Structure formats: C-alpha cells, structure tokens
C-alpha cells in the first residue's frame, strides 16, 4: 500500500479497528522522540560492533 499511495500515516492497528488510517484513530507522536530511537540505536551499535577484546574481572 505505501509503495502505491504517497499518504504516509497508515500503520498497524493493534486495538482491532476496521480501518488502519490513523487520521481517525487519534494517535500522534513527536518527531524528536521517534528520531532519538534511530540515533541512539545506530550510534550505540557502532560501539557494540567495535569491541574485539572482552576482559571481565570476576568479583
């Protein structure tokens, strides 16, 4: 659907409504909040992948 139509506010309806268009379902999120999910994730995983030596001193 999203490849066909350019309207980009259709997602997964979890409450079981008959229509997936989110204009009528009253759901809104901030841009700064959804952006930080990608930024803090992709910036952390760079650090996770760059570890080769892993030394853990037993307590």
């Amino acid at each position: 659907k999203q490849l066909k139509e350019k309207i980009s506010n259709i997602g997964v309806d979890c409450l079981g409504y008959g229509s997936n268009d989110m204009k009528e379902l009253f759901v809104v999120d901030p841009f700064i909040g959804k952006k930080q999910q990608i930024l803090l994730a992709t910036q952390l995983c760079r650090m996770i992948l760059k570890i080769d030596n892993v030394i853990i001193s037993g307590k």
Partner: protein
C-alpha cells in the same frame, strides 16, 4: 665448639627472591612486551577495533 646439632647454609638473596642468569630472561622480557603488543596490534588503523 658448635652451638648445636647442625647449621644450615645461608641463602644469599632473601627467601622467595626470584633471579635468573643467561639469555632466557631477556627473551622472556621481550616476549612479555610482545604479549602486550598483540593486544594493541588490531587496534591500529581507522578500521581497528576498540
């Protein structure tokens, strides 16, 4: 004349003091530096690892 039954010999260095002669120790010192060197071997370069 003697004070007692026997008299054990004195160790020159203190008991537990490690010491060694020959070319074995300097090779061990070089191998010790190479052991520390191998930890930082793949770290060198832009594509290195933390």
């Amino acid at each position: 004349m003697n004070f007692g039954s026997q008299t054990p010999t004195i160790v020159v260095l203190k008991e537990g003091t490690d010491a060694s002669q020959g070319k074995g120790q300097i090779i061990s010192n070089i191998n010790a530096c190479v052991a520390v060197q191998e930890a930082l071997k793949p770290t060198l370069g832009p594509l290195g690892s933390d």
